[PDB]
Amino acid sequence: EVETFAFQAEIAQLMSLIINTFYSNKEIFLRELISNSSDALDKIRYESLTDPSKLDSGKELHINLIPNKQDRTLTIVDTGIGMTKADLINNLGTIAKSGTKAFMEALQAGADISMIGQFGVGFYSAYLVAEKVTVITKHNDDEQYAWESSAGGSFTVRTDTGEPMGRGTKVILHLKEDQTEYLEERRIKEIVKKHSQFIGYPITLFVEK
Numbered sequence: 001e002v003e004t005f006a007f008q009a010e011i012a013q014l015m016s017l018i019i020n021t022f023y024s025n026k027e028i029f030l031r032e033l034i035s036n037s038s039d040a041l042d043k044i045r046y047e048s049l050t051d052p053s054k055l056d057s058g059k060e061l062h063i064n065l066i067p068n069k070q071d072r073t074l075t076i077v078d079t080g081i082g083m084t085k086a087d088l089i090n091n092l093g094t095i096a097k098s099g100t101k102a103f104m105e106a107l108q109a110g111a112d113i114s115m116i117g118q119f120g121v122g123f124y125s126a127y128l129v130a131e132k133v134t135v136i137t138k139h140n141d142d143e144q145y146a147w148e149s150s151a152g153g154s155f156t157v158r159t160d161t162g163e164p165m166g167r168g169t170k171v172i173l174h175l176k177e178d179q180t181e182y183l184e185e186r187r188i189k190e191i192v193k194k195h196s197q198f199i200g201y202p203i204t205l206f207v208e209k
């Protein structure tokens with residue numbers, strides 16, 4: 001059972017704007033995704049100060065950067081609060097319509113793509129370097145779901161059958177054929193130290209063969 005949904009008209013034109021606009025400062029995607037992971041970890045930590053039973057699905061709060069050359073994927077793993085099914089379909093799409101409309105008005109006013117985080121839609125910066133994005137997430141109050149989109153105005157959602165996460169969000173970036181630089185160890189270490197040095201959670205960058 002794989003359900004296919006259509007993006008909102010405002011989210012669709014933002015995606016095509018990110019896909020089609022010539023813009024060479026593409027590395028800002030990792031800051032936006034790590035900043036998105038840091039917010040999810042803050043929310044589960046806050047909910048735990050008044051309820052220590054919410055870490056039952058995992059006490060550790062960290063962020064993992066796992067590059068893969070054989071599959072040509074960069075994965076950002078966090079043990080944050082996760083996202084529910086209503087989040088993946090209705091909720092965040094409604095929150096993002098205002099920041100989207102504000103982001104375009106800023107772009108015609110002189111702003112550039114790197115300012116996408118101050119409008120709450122920084123996740124779509126992943127499509128600067130990805131031709132397809134997979135999101136595996138697990139919320140304490142919901143099952144494990146798989147989100148996927150390759151632009152075009154549509155996305156899919158299904159119940160994931162893979163490895164149980166316990167709690168968190170896994171963002172898999174299927175890198176474009178000409179964007180394999182973000183699979184290199186020394187490159188990722190440079191973007192992290194430059195853009196996300198003050199993230200208050202341990203960031204472990206994995207290495208491969």
Ligand SMILES: Cc1c(CO)cnn1-c1ccccc1
Binds near residue numbers: 122147
């Ligand atoms: C996290 C997020 C926002 C807020 O920036 C807007 N859309 N999304 C999102 C991401 C992945 C899948 C479905 C929706």
